[PDB]
């Protein structure tokens, strides 16, 4: 049972988009904050006014909220993933 749908993309020509809304849960960065271009902000993530999420990081708050404060920093390969219900 391993049928590959040939309509599956193998080169998206547009990388993993930075800000991934998850059904009316548009993650929000403040105009002062700095997220890298590699980082992936999916779901209920908020970056509050001076924080920095450095290259190669992932924040998928799809179960709960994840909120980075005033000038906090989350370094390179961090992974923040809200736990279960």
């Amino acid at each position: 049972s391993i049928t590959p749908s040939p309509d599956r993309v193998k080169w998206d020509y547009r990388g993993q988009r930075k800000i991934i809304p998850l059904g009316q849960w548009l993650p929000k960065v403040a105009v002062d904050a700095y997220v890298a271009p590699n980082v992936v902000l999916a779901g209920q993530v908020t970056v509050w006014d001076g924080a920095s999420v450095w290259p190669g990081c992932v924040l998928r708050g799809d179960l709960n909220k994840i909120s980075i404060g005033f000038c906090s920093n989350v370094q390179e390969r961090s992974v923040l993933h809200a736990a279960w219900t």
Binding site: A30, V31, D32, D49
Partner: protein, 72 residues
């Protein structure tokens, strides 16, 4: 020199308006020229209008001289 003071004033005010909201100083580097232009024209017209109103005030005072000349 008036236009230079006006231009510097416009540039300063535009950098200000770009600094209040935390976005960087020269966010739209094509607004700053509009700011310089508006500041220049404003200061030039302000000097012109001050000269004009001084002239009118001096005429009004000269006419007030006659209102008190008949007083004596």
């Amino acid at each position: 020199s008036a236009t230079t003071i006006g231009a510097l004033l416009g540039l300063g005010t535009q950098m200000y308006s770009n600094a209040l909201r935390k976005l960087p100083y020269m966010r739209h580097p094509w607004e700053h020229v509009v700011g310089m232009g508006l500041g220049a024209v404003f200061v030039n017209q302000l000097l012109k209008w001050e000269a004009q109103v001084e002239q009118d005030l001096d005429k009004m005072l000269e006419k007030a001289k006659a209102a008190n000349e008949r007083r004596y």
